[PDB]
């Protein structure tokens, strides 16, 4: 019980810190709360317009998709993995929010050298302006 509580507290702290760092990209201030009584994870995000941290459910679809992407990165962070592989995510985000999610993924995963990430997406990354950054490798298959 003591070991599990220590491990859970450490994992939750790492996830919360990673989520707070991820939300800084969109100029947002966010936090995660884990409740055993409700057995639920609550995300509180404060944007530039509101002065009070509203529930993540009380947000737009793009903000919710960005929060989900940040949660995925914050869940990947606590478990130190040498290799992480992800399939396409273009269908879950539309237009601008998809570009913002791709930018967040590139910014959060290019810096870390301990983890090698393989992202498989059909959308051409070369179209995105954020390809100048070093440490990102694009492997486009010549044969469609």
């Amino acid at each position: 019980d003591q070991n599990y509580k220590n491990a859970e507290k450490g994992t939750c702290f790492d996830a919360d810190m990673d989520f707070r760092a991820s939300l800084k990209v969109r100029k947002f201030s966010g936090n995660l709360s884990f409740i055993k009584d409700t057995k639920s994870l609550e995300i509180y995000i404060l944007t530039t317009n509101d002065e009070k941290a509203r529930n993540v459910d009380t947000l737009s679809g793009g903000e919710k998709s960005f929060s989900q992407m940040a949660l995925l990165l914050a869940t990947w962070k606590p478990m130190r993995s040498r290799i992480i592989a992800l399939d396409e995510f273009d269908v879950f985000m539309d237009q601008v929010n998809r570009k913002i999610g791709t930018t967040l993924i590139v910014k959060k995963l290019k810096d870390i050298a301990r983890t090698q990430t393989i992202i498989i997406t059909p959308q051409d990354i070369g179209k995105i302006a954020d390809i100048d950054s070093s440490g990102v490798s694009i492997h486009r298959m010549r044969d469609p």
């Binding site: 003591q2 507290k9 939750c12 702290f13 919360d16 810190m17 707070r20 201030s29 966010g30 936090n31 709360s33 884990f34 509180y44 404060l46 002065e51 941290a53």
Partner: protein, 527 residues
């Protein structure tokens, strides 16, 4: 005065606060880490984070105001009545110290750091940020309107505070929320002052370990906030009317507004010296007291009290706390312009002096009187202690002698010759000397009044030495005549001593004056 009240280089004044300081990236990251750890109820890691980098580096880790409130709430969770809860929260006590004790130690150490600004030891920006956090915590700790017997605002928009979603730490409500109640702050002060001298083990543990240090920290922080308010919040040059209105809005004015009662002088005098040796005058109504946090008056079976404190130690601590409260009250009173009086608080300096003098003169135990009138530092308590001593001496002379001699010793502290001449005049009238009117049956009460009068005179002499030093004790004939008059008073007391009414020798101040400035009993024991 010091750099603490006159450092506004990095401040960003706002409508809510004039002391607001913006956060840097490193400080923002530290604030976020502390809030995140507090959210998971990992207080042990929060204390470890604060302690690991304390005093080991040039830079200072600033505690956020919400974390300061969390530490204040933790300080209330004493082991004697919350041992199972603390053990459940931290089954492996790696620090081998109670969370309440660690939080109190951190708060006291940070208060000590805040009191003196060491620009060489710590960067000014960190010190200003810490001052801003403490002032924000004090502003959140504003007392509610007094009852005889808005939830949370975060100035920093960079991070989400932990206190926004929670109102309790470990089953105990936040200290700011508990004190922001109509009948809690005055109740807390009365409870701690009553339990300071209580023999009962649970009541004594409740104050000595929890309320006494927290009250001292709050008084020091309120004094610093009052200094900052007087230095910056005021408009400098004033018509002497707006300044009174601003002083009515001062943090000390709100602090003592919760203790206004019906008559401030008598009720305040009873409150400060509550449960003391003095006989209660005019059968004053008893003041209700209840534990602030659930069973503060109960001791859990697991905890075993293995600490015993002597009555003198408890009395010394209680009288020191009372002196701090009276000093804060006088510090608020001295700023009031002459003639004008504060509107919101019905407080008068003369009324407070008279009430304190009446309470001190009513003491039947000399030990508490000496504890109140003996201070380690004369300069710190120089503004109100001489006034209280003069008032107590005047009242003692009034009750003992039918003739009341007006005392101007406080204004005579500037000139030693005038003070010595006034002392010679008082001793010549025999008001200072033992009164022949007192009967042999009531000799002990007369001795009790005489020793208190001697203590008041000794305090005034110590202040005179602090103001003038030792330069003309024998060079000026007036001081030599004053010492001869003290010897004559000693001979008058020796007349009653030779009367042999009681074996105990009547108290003589000649040895104490000789040690302080009597130059070894003049020529009596110079050889």
């Amino acid at each position: 005065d010091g750099a603490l009240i006159n450092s506004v280089l990095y401040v960003s004044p706002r409508n809510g606060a004039h002391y607001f300081v913006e956060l840097t990236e490193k400080h923002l990251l530290a604030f976020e880490m502390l809030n995140s750890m507090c959210l998971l109820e990992n207080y042990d890691h929060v204390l470890l984070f604060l302690e690991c980098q304390f005093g080991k580096s040039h830079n200072l880790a600033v505690i956020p105001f919400d974390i300061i409130l969390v530490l204040f709430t933790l300080s209330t969770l004493s082991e004697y009545y919350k041992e199972p809860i603390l053990r459940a929260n931290d089954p492996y006590n790696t620090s081998r110290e109670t969370l309440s004790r660690r939080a109190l130690k951190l708060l006291q150490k940070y208060l000590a750091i805040l009191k003196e600004f060491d620009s060489e030891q710590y960067n000014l920006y960190d010190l200003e940020l810490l001052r801003c956090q403490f002032f924000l915590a004090i502003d959140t700790l504003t007392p509610k309107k007094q009852k005889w017997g808005k939830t949370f605002k975060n100035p920093y928009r960079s991070y989400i505070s932990c206190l926004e979603q929670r109102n309790t730490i470990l089953g105990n409500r936040l200290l700011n929320l508990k004190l922001n109640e109509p009948g809690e702050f005055i109740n807390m002060i009365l409870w701690t002052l009553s339990n300071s001298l209580q023999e009962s083990t649970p009541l004594f543990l409740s104050s000595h370990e929890i309320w006494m240090p927290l009250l001292e920290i709050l008084i020091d922080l309120f004094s610093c906030r009052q200094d900052y308010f007087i230095q910056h919040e005021v408009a400098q040059n004033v018509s002497k009317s707006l300044f009174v209105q601003r002083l009515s809005e001062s943090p000390l004015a709100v602090f003592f507004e919760s203790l206004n009662t019906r008559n401030f002088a008598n009720r305040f005098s009873e409150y400060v010296f509550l449960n003391c040796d003095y006989k209660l005058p005019s059968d004053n109504y008893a003041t209700p007291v209840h534990p602030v946090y659930n069973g503060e008056n109960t001791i859990v079976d697991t905890y075993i009290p293995t600490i015993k404190c002597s009555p003198l130690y408890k009395s010394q601590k209680s009288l020191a706390l009372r002196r701090k409260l009276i000093g804060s009250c006088f510090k608020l009173l001295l700023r009031v312009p002459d003639g004008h009086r504060l509107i919101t608080p019905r407080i008068v300096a003369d009324d407070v002096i008279q009430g304190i003098s009446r309470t001190l003169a009513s003491f039947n135990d000399i030990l508490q009187f000496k504890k109140f009138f003996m201070t380690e530092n004369l300069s710190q308590e120089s503004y109100f202690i001489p006034l209280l001593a003069e008032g107590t001496l005047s009242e003692i002379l009034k009750d003992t002698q039918e003739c009341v001699v007006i005392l101007t010793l406080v204004e005579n502290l500037s000139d030693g010759v005038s003070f010595c001449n006034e002392v010679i005049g008082l001793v010549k009238s025999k008001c200072f000397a033992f009164t022949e009117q007192c009967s042999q049956a009531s000799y002990e009460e007369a001795v009790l009044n005489i020793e208190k009068c001697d203590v008041c005179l000794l305090v005034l002499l110590r202040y005179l030495l602090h103001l003038i030093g030792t330069e003309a004790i024998l060079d000026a004939k007036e001081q030599l005549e004053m010492l001869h008059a003290i010897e004559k008073n000693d001979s008058g007391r020796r007349q009653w001593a030779k009367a042999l009414n009681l074996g105990n020798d009547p108290p003589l101040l000649y040895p104490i004056v000789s040690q302080m400035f009597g130059v070894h009993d003049k020529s009596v024991i110079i050889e």
